[PDB]
Amino acid sequence: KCPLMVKVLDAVRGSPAINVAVHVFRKAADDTWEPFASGKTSESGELHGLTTEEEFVEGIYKVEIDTKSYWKALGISPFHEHAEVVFTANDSGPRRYTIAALLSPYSYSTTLVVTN
Amino acid sequence: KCPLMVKVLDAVRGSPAINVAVHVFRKAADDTWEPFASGKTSESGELHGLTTEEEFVEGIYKVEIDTKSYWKALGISPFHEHAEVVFTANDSGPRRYTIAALLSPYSYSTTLVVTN
Amino acid sequence: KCPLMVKVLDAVRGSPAINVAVHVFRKAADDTWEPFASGKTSESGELHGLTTEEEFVEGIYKVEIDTKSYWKALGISPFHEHAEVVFTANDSGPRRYTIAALLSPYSYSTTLVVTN
Amino acid sequence: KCPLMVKVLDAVRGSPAINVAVHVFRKAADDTWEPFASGKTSESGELHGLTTEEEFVEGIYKVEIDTKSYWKALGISPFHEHAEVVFTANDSGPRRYTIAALLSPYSYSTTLVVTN
């Protein structure tokens, strides 16, 4: 069961955000963002299978959601370049992480949900 | 498959809101709020089985989430009395409705998500 | 200086919500909602002068924002009937209350801000 | 009158977020983030005077709010590293930009408001 999931909703259409590009980065020891995983949300607005328990280690992660491209595929030209969530992953045993995002053209909300 | 679901998240603890009381009301012809359904969110913060396709007809509905009692069961004394969402149900074919709520002691966000 | 203010923003247009109708109600001893004050937001999305320090006493208050009518004056037909915030006013000395609201067609966020 | 303002609110305490560090970056032609301006929010949670009309030119900007340090000065150890808003500034005549942020330990909301 994946330890990292992303769900994206659309506040303008009141539906899941489908086929949104999501890029995950990890901060390396050289303090540079290194591509870690990426994918596209499904018809339910959810993106599963980003990583595995073995690959997802403690560190600083950045979740970048390409909101601008998604809005333009629906006919909207927004003003944000992307939604971004930066969080620290910690070990306690074992912790799953879900990033929930709510998108509007000029506003976004993100929540970090931690379940077992 | 239920046509009305409610999911509640906790922005302070970064987890689903468990055992939150949810009351659903429908506006009758006499313009009074009539109890329609109610329940409590599960360990996943979701409340399923509120109604059925046959009982859930067009109308004005009110979803009241008892945030104040939930915060006090966790040790928090908030300032909102409850989170409330009032929406119109419409027929097009057949439409499922999900109310998503994000709770803080002095703030809440609600989203109406419509899936097929 | 008014003890109760309401500010409303538009997440779709990225601007203040102008000329939004706001109705404030107070719960009387008979447990009925009694009209207390109302007004319309200015070009800055703010509504000042709802009440006075002498009229604004402890109690349960409901702030109803007529989102549906505002969206339809801009060309949008939303799905929420209105945004509603219910809170308890308390005395400590003297406390000003500001209700901040962020509106989307299928989502809204409200925050209760308390300043001195 | 400054063309760029940042206001930050606290959803846990229901108050303005005071003395939050804010860093603004601009994307240069070499596609690197170059420090542009920074400051700290006042008792009202607002940060004025970040830049001037002459210095604030079209481009890609990043507004980084140091949420983690602010929470720890109040006794809270959060999970986000910072709130970040990336937007494009455009010329039309003349446009002021306000970034509004609502902070919780495990959630944040940001809105881009454009006034004249």
From Swiss-Prot, chains A, B, C, D:
- Cite the effect that the entry attributes to residue 25 to C: In a patient with amyloidosis
Tell me the residues on which 4-carboxyglutamate occurs.
34
Q: Which pairs of positions does the record mark as disulfide bonds?
A: none
Q: What is the effect of changing residue 56 to L?
A: In AMYLD1; amyloid polyneuropathy
What does the UniProt record report as the effect of altering residue 99 to V in this chain?
Answer: In AMYLD1; amyloid polyneuropathy
Mutating residue 108 to V: what's the consequence?
A: Requires 2 nucleotide substitutions
User: What happens after mutating residue 52 to A?
Assistant: In AMYLD1; amyloid polyneuropathy and cardiomyopathy
Family as reported in the entry's similarity comment: Belongs to the transthyretin family.
Name this protein carries in UniProt = Transthyretin
Q: What is the lineage of its organism?
A: Eukaryota, Metazoa, Chordata, Craniata, Vertebrata
Q: Gene of origin?
A: TTR
Entire-sequence positions represented here: 29 to 144 of 147
